[PDB]
Amino acid sequence: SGFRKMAFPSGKVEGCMVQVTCGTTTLNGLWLDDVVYCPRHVICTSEDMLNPNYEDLLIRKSNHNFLVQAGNVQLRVIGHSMQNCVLKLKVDTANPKTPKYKFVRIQPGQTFSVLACYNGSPSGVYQCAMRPNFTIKGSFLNGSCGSVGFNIDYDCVSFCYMHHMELPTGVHAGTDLEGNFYGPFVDRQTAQAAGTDTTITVNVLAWLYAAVINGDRWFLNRFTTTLNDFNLVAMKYNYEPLTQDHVDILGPLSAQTGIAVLDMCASLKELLQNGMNGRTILGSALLEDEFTPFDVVRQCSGVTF
Amino acid sequence: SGFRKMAFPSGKVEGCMVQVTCGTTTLNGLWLDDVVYCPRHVICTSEDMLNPNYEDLLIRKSNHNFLVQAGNVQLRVIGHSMQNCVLKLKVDTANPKTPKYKFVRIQPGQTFSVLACYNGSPSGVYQCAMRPNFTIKGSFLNGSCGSVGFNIDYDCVSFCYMHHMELPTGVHAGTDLEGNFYGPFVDRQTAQAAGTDTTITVNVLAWLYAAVINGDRWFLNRFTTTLNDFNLVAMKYNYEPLTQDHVDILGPLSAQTGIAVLDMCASLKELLQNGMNGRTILGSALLEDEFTPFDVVRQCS
Ligand SMILES: *[C@@H](C[N+](=O)[O-])[C@H](C[C@@H]1CCNC1=O)NC(=O)[C@H](CC(C)C)NC(=O)c1cc2c(OC)cccc2[nH]1
Ligand SMILES: *[C@@H](C[N+](=O)[O-])[C@H](C[C@H]1CCNC1=O)NC(=O)[C@H](CC(C)C)NC(=O)c1cc2c(OC)cccc2[nH]1
Questions:
Q1: In chain B, is it the N or the C terminus that has fewer CB atoms within a 10 Å radius of its CB?
Q2: Are residues B233 and B299 in the same domain?
Q3: Is the distance from CB of A62 to CB of A76 less than 8 angstroms?
């Protein structure tokens, strides 16, 4: 027992991290088979970044302007293309450490592990959630661009995030592995403002189910509710409404505790419309919203990869 | 910018995790060169664990009683010994993935990454601190024993922890890689209580510095205090004393933020006296003590 923020083990992603340099600009890339994926702004100088034209800057670049390195070992670039905000660089060597993988585009509320990297080189791993306003409350310094976020689905790595920028509020924004931004953000040296953020309701429920599993269940009331009524009340508290997928993924925790999704919702509706008194849940007066239902089962059940 | 509980990348340790079976008990071992390290209680039955005499249990075993598994491949055990609570299994194959490594014993207040494993397979990685009462607040189920804790410096893995026990309070106990327990615990099947746990003051200060670096200044004041006066109040609330060494190690965070360590001590004393009045610091409702000054420097410079 115990309940921690746990990242997936990072080894399969570590064997895929490379350095990509165009002139003086160095950032991180992901080497899967004979392609390296990285942020397209590697082709910019400091001054270009202000308001770049990426088609115009790329047309002037050839394979031989790109330095890809695995540690201090050069991989020759034999092709390049831009796909949205990502650059794909074909290289002469198939990565012998390529895991089984997919490119996934995640929903707000979903968590993933970030492998923070500097000059190709993994530095740290932590667990994040995609916020409802399409930011992540990450930890990133200069040189971190192209660090990836991922889930592991047994032997399969699912890549969901590539890091591109820090908003003025110190939160972070990036793309899926096809170079489409999460949220309305653009890759430009421009101060961009995120939407007002909300609490991830499905994740708070998952945490409530985790408490109940650990025999802390004082907050169970005798009520139920409709999904719609709950969704209308939850939006008044700055809480994300629930989808049919949200109800479905709470299924296993519902089955294991014997508590219907809509009874737990009615319990959480009373928590918002009342507060905690000064009482605690899993030792906390703050409701945690960065554990998914899968995060609660994976960790309470010891799932491996 | 931003601040997160961050673990070391796990890859160099994942390459060393193996499954160890003796009779009906399976747990994790650490395969470095031609040795597999694992908890010794794997030689025990549901009888033995109640009051095991491990010298006796071990002399009654041979190599063939130990089934080591690295992926799909069984490893041949060509010898065995015991160093305190850790079993050493000599095998006929050296681990090609053996990183540069040391065995260190860490001090209370120091942090490390844990790679939680089940049946020799990695499940999860998280950051922990050795509590002053030599417990850790981990996340560990049945099968987790032999999971290791570690720091990485350059290409050197410093192993500092192997997992053995859950206490009734739901915290965790285990050994260094020489098989000496952190704290007054024993690898027996019994309820064991720990000493009263103190808060790691130097770590709470580092985290307040992290908070200020991330633009979070509400708890600051224009009071100051002596070190002794701060320590009188800290000790009253079951916080560890702050030493001059601790003050010195906060230096770089004081210099970065332009807040003198004793001015941050004055902030912490007000927080201990008044509480946080429903407010949060870096998204926490409680004073966090599992980040070292170095953890803060590493992430905030
Ligand atoms: C990666 C770039 N690289 O390594 O090549 C960084 C990661 C940032 C830096 C600090 N913390 C992080 O997460 N990306 C950037 O610096 C990014 C580059 C653009 C995509 C071209 N810019 C920003 O993240 C940025 C720019 C501004 C700004 O413009 C003057 C004002 C306010 C905030 C801001 N953030
Ligand atoms: C690992 C064993 N393995 O083969 O994997 C176990 C660690 C898990 C258990 C669930 N949570 C964890 O961290 N270790 C044990 O189960 C350990 C075995 C002895 C050292 C031989 N025992 C305990 O952790 C234990 C026993 C106990 C007790 O005895 C009657 C009463 C209250 C709490 C207890 N915890």
A1: C
A2: yes
A3: no
